[PDB]
């Protein structure tokens, strides 16, 4: 939990995404959870190749699935703004925006996130 500016911004981003989507979350996001997602699940880097490590935030991955605590991907703020504009705002499957190689790498992280959820 060494990058508190990122965890604070990620909470604000996810709550802003929920507000825009008209989504009333089962449970709110918090800084400790963002620390866990960014630093532990996504090993302190963007899920998107080439896994840039600076200005990491968290986004809702798939807008066609529930906005829950397993539908979350770490990426740079610049990658997040592209994701919000081209995936979330258009309510499209991420595989229409990202190539098969990128989807496979992200899916490996989402598998980790769902499998770890029990132990969290």
Answer yes or no: are the C-beta atoms of 78 and 36 closer than 8 Å: no
Cα–Cα separations (whole angstroms), residue 99 to 36, 49, 94: 27, 11, 9
Count other Cβ atoms within 10 Å, centred on residue 62.
Answer: 18
Looking up tokens 């098969």, which residue turns up?
Answer: 100
**How is residue 87 written in tokens?**
């995936």
Q: Kindly report the CA angle at 31 between 30 and 32, in degrees rounded to 5?
A: 95
Q: Gaps in the chain (C–N > 2.5 Å) come after which residues?
A: none
Delimit the domains of the chain by residue range.
4-116
CA–CA separation, 112 and 3 (whole Å): 22
Q: Which two tokens stand for residue 49?
A: 């190749």
What technique was this entry resolved by? Answer: X-ray
Q: How far is CA 10 from the centre of its chain?
A: 9
How many Cα atoms sit within 13 Å of 61 on the Cβ side? 22
């Amino acid at each position: 939990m060494t990058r508190p500016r990122l965890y604070e911004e990620a909470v604000k981003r996810l709550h802003a995404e929920a507000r825009k989507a008209g989504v009333n979350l089962d449970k709110t996001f918090n800084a400790s959870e963002m620390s866990y997602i960014i630093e532990e699940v996504y090993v302190g880097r963007s899920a998107l190749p080439p896994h840039e490590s600076q200005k990491v935030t968290v986004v809702r991955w798939n807008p066609q699935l529930p906005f829950d605590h397993t539908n979350l991907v770490a990426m740079t703020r610049n990658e997040a703004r592209y994701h919000e504009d081209n995936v979330l705002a258009k309510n499209v499957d991420p595989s229409t925006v990202y190539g098969k190689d990128v989807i496979e790498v992200v899916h490996s992280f989402l598998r980790r996130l769902r499998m770890w959820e029990m132990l969290y």
